């Protein structure tokens, strides 16, 4: 009995030395978070209908009224990025 128990422990050590897709449920949570982070990063490169997709590039070229009409947009598009990012994470935090 104790030997067939040790035989199964041995098979597990060989198995974990031989494979990685078995850990695939831990791989899944970190990959969900990896591509979710990657999504939020890509959205700092979106134009959102504004003149330009980068804030400090706008501050290098406009002033006070034709500047803020662009800054409220970047704000809108990014604000939606945060709403959605935190929605996707909150319903995820329920899975975890």
């Amino acid at each position: 009995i104790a030997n067939q128990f040790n035989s199964a422990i041995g098979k597990i050590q060989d198995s974990l030395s031989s494979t990685a897709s078995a850990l695939g449920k831990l791989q899944d949570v970190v990959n969900q978070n990896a591509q979710a982070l990657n999504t939020l990063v890509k959205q700092l490169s979106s134009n959102f209908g504004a003149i330009s997709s980068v804030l400090n590039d706008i501050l290098a070229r406009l002033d006070k009224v034709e500047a803020e009409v662009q800054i409220d947009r970047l704000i809108t598009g990014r604000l939606q990025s945060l709403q959605t990012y935190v929605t996707q994470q909150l319903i995820r935090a329920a899975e975890i």
Partner: protein
């Protein structure tokens, strides 16, 4: 090696400016990170 507001040939930012061992090709003037943001620059007065 100090925190500064900067304007490099019209490309502005705020940060610490520090030397680099990453060798740009002769024709390049900006670099870009994974995050698309400007990680590295070549000065227009002195080609470091």
């Amino acid at each position: 090696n100090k925190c500064v507001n900067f304007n490099f040939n019209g490309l502005t930012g705020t940060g610490v400016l520090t030397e680099s061992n990453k060798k740009f090709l002769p024709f390049q003037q900006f670099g870009r990170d994974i995050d698309d943001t400007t990680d590295a620059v070549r000065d227009p007065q002195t080609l470091e």
